[PDB]
Amino acid sequence: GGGPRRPRXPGDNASIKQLHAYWQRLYAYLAAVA
Amino acid sequence: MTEYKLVVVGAVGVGKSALTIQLIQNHFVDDSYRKQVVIDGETCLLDILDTAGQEEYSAMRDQYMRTGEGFLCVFAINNTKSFEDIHHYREQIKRVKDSEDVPMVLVGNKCDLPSRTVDTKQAQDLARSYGIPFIETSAKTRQGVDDAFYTLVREIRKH
Amino acid sequence: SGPRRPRXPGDQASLEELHEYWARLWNYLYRVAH
Numbered sequence A: 001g002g003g004p005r006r007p008r009x010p011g012d013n014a015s016i017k018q019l020h021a022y023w024q025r026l027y028a029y030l031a032a033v034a
Numbered sequence B: 001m002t003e004y005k006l007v008v009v010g011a012v013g014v015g016k017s018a019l020t021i022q023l024i025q026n027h028f029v030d031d032s033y034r035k036q037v038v039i040d041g042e043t044c045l046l047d048i049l050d051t052a053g054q055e056e057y058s059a060m061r062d063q064y065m066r067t068g069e070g071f072l073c074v075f076a077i078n079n080t081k082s083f084e085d086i087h088h089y090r091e092q093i094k095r096v097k098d099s100e101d102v103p104m105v106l107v108g109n110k111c112d113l114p115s116r117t118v119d120t121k122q123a124q125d126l127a128r129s130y131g132i133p134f135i136e137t138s139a140k141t142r143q144g145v146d147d148a149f150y151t152l153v154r155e156i157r158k159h
Numbered sequence C: 001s002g003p004r005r006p007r008x009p010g011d012q013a014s015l016e017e018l019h020e021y022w023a024r025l026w027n028y029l030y031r032v033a034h
């Protein structure tokens, strides 16, 4: 099923605050898979 | 394949963006911020943060800077003020990183200009006092561009 | 003028596409932080 969970991009309409969250989560995901 | 997060800082117009573009896209005129390279036989993945010359404080910008593992501190060899400003950037980096020992490389850019106001010895001296390497670059001719970034990766690996 | 927001990478993006997107997002967020 799953290992580290891949975050979903919060969308084309996302706020900067949502993207800042996504940026951290995606950093963590990509580091967790390495 | 190890990932490195590199950050480029320095005064307005020193050539931070031109250096990044030359590294990634291999050209110069007068978006990708990632490159796969092979340093000393080792495959490395570089992400580059190309910062702004005009400082503006924000908590979020500091957070983006803290992600950096190594910093290029860039001045232009025909802009003494940008050379004097290097101290500002170095101290800001130690502060964001809350460390006295952050991987850094001093970069003197625009070395294609015969008319310079900062001499090689002046810059080598400063770098010596910091205990960091000095590399001369020209984003224009591509002189030293790979060398500056690869040397930063070697600096990170001294940690 | 103004920073280009990178487009969402897509739910089935490759790890390399996510990495490329992440580096772009890092720079975008840095630029727009106000």
Ligand SMILES: Nc1nc2c(ncn2[C@@H]2O[C@H](COP(=O)(O)OP(=O)(O)NP(=O)(O)O)[C@@H](O)[C@H]2O)c(=O)[nH]1
Pocket (backbone or CB within 6 Å): B010, B011, B012, B013, B014, B015, B016, B017, B018, B019, B029, B030, B051, B052, B053, B054, B109, B110, B111, B112, B113, B137, B138, B139, B140, B141
């Ligand atoms: N001759 C020469 N011009 C250069 C070199 N690097 C950059 N330039 C020129 O210097 C100017 C500023 O370059 P730029 O890449 O925008 O610098 P910056 O440090 O990113 N500026 P900013 O702080 O505003 O983001 C441009 O005209 C650019 O072409 C170089 O090595 N040689």
Ligand SMILES: [Mg+2]
Pocket (backbone or CB within 6 Å): B016, B017, B018, B050, B051, B052
């Ligand atoms: Mg720039």
